[PDB]
Protein backbone atom coordinates (compact mmCIF):
# COMPACT_ATOMS: atom_id res chain seq x y z
CA UNK A 1 0.00 0.00 0.00
CA UNK A 2 1.30 3.48 -1.08
CA UNK A 3 -0.08 5.23 2.08
CA UNK A 4 0.90 3.95 5.57
CA UNK A 5 -1.96 3.93 8.10
CA UNK A 6 -1.68 3.61 11.93
CA UNK A 7 -2.13 0.12 13.42
CA UNK A 8 -5.49 -1.52 14.13
CA UNK A 9 -6.83 -0.50 17.62
CA UNK A 10 -9.41 -1.71 20.18
CA UNK A 11 -11.29 0.94 22.23
CA UNK A 12 -14.21 0.96 24.70
CA UNK A 13 -17.51 2.64 23.83
CA UNK A 14 -17.56 6.48 24.31
CA UNK A 15 -13.77 6.63 23.85
CA UNK A 16 -12.17 8.94 21.26
CA UNK A 17 -10.07 7.07 18.64
CA UNK A 18 -7.64 8.81 16.19
CA UNK A 19 -6.48 6.92 13.08
CA UNK A 20 -3.63 8.44 11.08
CA UNK A 21 -1.99 8.07 7.64
CA UNK A 22 1.34 9.16 6.17
CA UNK A 23 2.10 9.68 2.48
CA UNK A 24 4.51 11.67 0.30
CA UNK A 25 4.71 15.15 -1.23
CA UNK A 26 3.10 13.76 -4.45
CA UNK A 27 -0.12 12.51 -2.68
CA UNK A 28 -1.12 13.81 0.79
CA UNK A 29 1.40 16.71 0.65
CA UNK A 30 -0.42 18.14 -2.44
CA UNK A 31 -3.97 16.63 -2.43
CA UNK A 32 -6.88 16.32 0.04
CA UNK A 33 -7.60 12.99 1.76
CA UNK A 34 -10.85 10.96 1.68
CA UNK A 35 -11.78 8.35 4.31
CA UNK A 36 -13.65 5.13 3.41
CA UNK A 37 -15.53 2.99 6.00
CA UNK A 38 -15.88 -0.75 5.21
CA UNK A 39 -18.35 -2.15 7.76
CA UNK A 40 -17.90 -5.86 8.55
CA UNK A 41 -19.33 -7.95 5.67
CA UNK A 42 -20.38 -4.78 3.71
CA UNK A 43 -19.18 -2.83 0.61
CA UNK A 44 -17.03 0.21 1.47
CA UNK A 45 -18.73 3.64 1.50
CA UNK A 46 -17.39 7.23 1.73
CA UNK A 47 -17.21 8.67 5.27
CA UNK A 48 -15.13 11.89 4.75
CA UNK A 49 -14.29 13.90 1.63
CA UNK A 50 -11.72 16.71 0.94
CA UNK A 51 -9.90 16.30 4.36
CA UNK A 52 -12.81 17.37 6.57
CA UNK A 53 -16.23 17.35 4.77
CA UNK A 54 -18.63 14.63 6.13
CA UNK A 55 -20.34 12.52 3.42
CA UNK A 56 -24.13 12.99 3.55
CA UNK A 57 -25.74 11.07 6.47
CA UNK A 58 -22.39 10.60 8.34
CA UNK A 59 -22.42 11.48 12.08
CA UNK A 60 -20.50 14.63 13.15
CA UNK A 61 -18.80 12.32 15.69
CA UNK A 62 -16.35 11.85 12.75
CA UNK A 63 -13.80 14.59 12.02
CA UNK A 64 -10.75 14.75 9.69
CA UNK A 65 -7.73 16.96 9.04
CA UNK A 66 -4.52 17.00 6.96
CA UNK A 67 -1.11 18.56 7.75
CA UNK A 68 2.03 18.25 5.61
CA UNK A 69 2.28 14.62 4.30
CA UNK A 70 -0.08 13.35 7.14
CA UNK A 71 -3.88 13.15 7.68
CA UNK A 72 -6.05 11.87 10.53
CA UNK A 73 -9.59 10.73 11.26
CA UNK A 74 -11.01 11.08 14.77
CA UNK A 75 -14.11 9.19 16.07
CA UNK A 76 -15.68 10.78 19.20
CA UNK A 77 -18.22 8.87 21.34
CA UNK A 78 -17.21 5.46 19.84
CA UNK A 79 -20.25 3.15 19.40
CA UNK A 80 -20.35 -0.58 18.46
CA UNK A 81 -21.65 0.22 14.90
CA UNK A 82 -18.33 2.13 14.29
CA UNK A 83 -16.41 -1.21 14.30
CA UNK A 84 -15.04 -1.24 10.73
CA UNK A 85 -11.99 -1.14 8.47
CA UNK A 86 -11.10 2.54 7.75
CA UNK A 87 -9.13 3.37 4.55
CA UNK A 88 -7.39 6.60 3.54
CA UNK A 89 -7.58 7.56 -0.16
CA UNK A 90 -5.88 10.43 -2.02
CA UNK A 91 -4.86 11.48 -5.55
CA UNK A 92 -1.12 10.90 -6.27
CA UNK A 93 0.28 13.43 -8.84
CA UNK A 94 3.18 11.00 -9.59
CA UNK A 95 0.99 7.91 -10.32
CA UNK A 96 -1.68 10.26 -11.84
CA UNK A 97 -4.26 8.11 -10.04
CA UNK A 98 -5.85 7.20 -6.68
CA UNK A 99 -3.65 5.71 -3.89
CA UNK A 100 -4.98 4.00 -0.75
CA UNK A 101 -3.81 2.91 2.67
CA UNK A 102 -3.90 -0.77 3.73
CA UNK A 103 -6.70 -0.04 6.23
CA UNK A 104 -6.95 0.37 10.04
CA UNK A 105 -9.42 -1.84 11.91
CA UNK A 106 -11.24 -0.23 14.92
CA UNK A 107 -12.64 -2.94 17.24
CA UNK A 108 -15.17 -1.74 19.84
CA UNK A 109 -14.64 -3.77 23.09
Amino acid sequence: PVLTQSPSVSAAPRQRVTISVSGSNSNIGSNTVNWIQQLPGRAPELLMCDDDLLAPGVSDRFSGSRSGTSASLTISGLQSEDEADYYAATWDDSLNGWVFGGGTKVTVL
Binding site: N34, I36, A43, P44, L46, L53, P56, A89, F100
Partner: protein
Protein backbone atom coordinates in the same frame (compact mmCIF):
# COMPACT_ATOMS: atom_id res chain seq x y z
CA UNK B 1 -35.96 26.00 -8.53
CA UNK B 2 -37.19 29.62 -8.53
CA UNK B 3 -33.96 31.61 -8.92
CA UNK B 4 -31.08 31.49 -11.46
CA UNK B 5 -28.56 30.18 -8.86
CA UNK B 6 -30.90 27.40 -7.66
CA UNK B 7 -31.62 26.42 -11.32
CA UNK B 8 -27.91 26.43 -12.26
CA UNK B 9 -26.83 24.33 -9.24
CA UNK B 10 -29.84 21.95 -9.87
CA UNK B 11 -28.67 21.07 -13.40
CA UNK B 12 -25.01 20.68 -12.30
CA UNK B 13 -26.07 18.29 -9.53
CA UNK B 14 -28.47 16.25 -11.83
CA UNK B 15 -25.43 15.69 -14.11
CA UNK B 16 -22.90 14.54 -11.46
CA UNK B 17 -22.65 10.81 -12.36
CA UNK B 18 -20.74 9.44 -9.25
CA UNK B 19 -23.34 10.54 -6.65
CA UNK B 20 -25.81 7.85 -5.50
CA UNK B 21 -29.57 8.74 -5.59
CA UNK B 22 -29.83 9.61 -1.86
CA UNK B 23 -26.81 11.98 -2.08
CA UNK B 24 -28.19 13.68 -5.23
CA UNK B 25 -31.73 13.99 -3.76
CA UNK B 26 -30.33 15.45 -0.48
CA UNK B 27 -28.38 18.19 -2.35
CA UNK B 28 -31.45 19.17 -4.50
CA UNK B 29 -33.63 19.19 -1.33
CA UNK B 30 -31.03 21.60 0.25
CA UNK B 31 -31.21 23.92 -2.83
CA UNK B 32 -35.00 24.17 -2.30
CA UNK B 33 -34.92 24.46 1.53
CA UNK B 34 -31.97 26.94 1.72
CA UNK B 35 -31.57 28.92 -1.54
CA UNK B 36 -28.85 31.17 0.06
CA UNK B 37 -26.78 27.90 0.47
CA UNK B 38 -26.91 27.16 -3.33
CA UNK B 39 -23.20 28.05 -3.84
CA UNK B 40 -22.08 26.01 -0.76
CA UNK B 41 -24.34 23.00 -1.76
CA UNK B 42 -22.97 23.01 -5.33
CA UNK B 43 -19.36 23.12 -4.02
CA UNK B 44 -20.04 20.27 -1.55
CA UNK B 45 -21.73 18.21 -4.38
CA UNK B 46 -18.71 18.75 -6.75
CA UNK B 47 -16.31 17.61 -4.00
CA UNK B 48 -18.41 14.56 -3.17
CA UNK B 49 -18.71 13.64 -6.90
CA UNK B 50 -14.85 13.68 -7.13
CA UNK B 51 -14.43 11.73 -3.81
CA UNK B 52 -17.02 9.09 -5.00
CA UNK B 53 -14.59 8.41 -7.96
CA UNK B 54 -11.88 7.34 -5.42
CA UNK B 55 -14.49 4.97 -3.81
CA UNK B 56 -15.23 3.51 -7.31
CA UNK B 57 -11.46 2.91 -7.95
CA UNK B 58 -11.17 1.25 -4.47
CA UNK B 59 -13.73 -1.46 -5.42
Amino acid sequence: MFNKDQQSAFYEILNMPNLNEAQRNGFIQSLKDDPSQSTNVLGEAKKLNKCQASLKSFQ
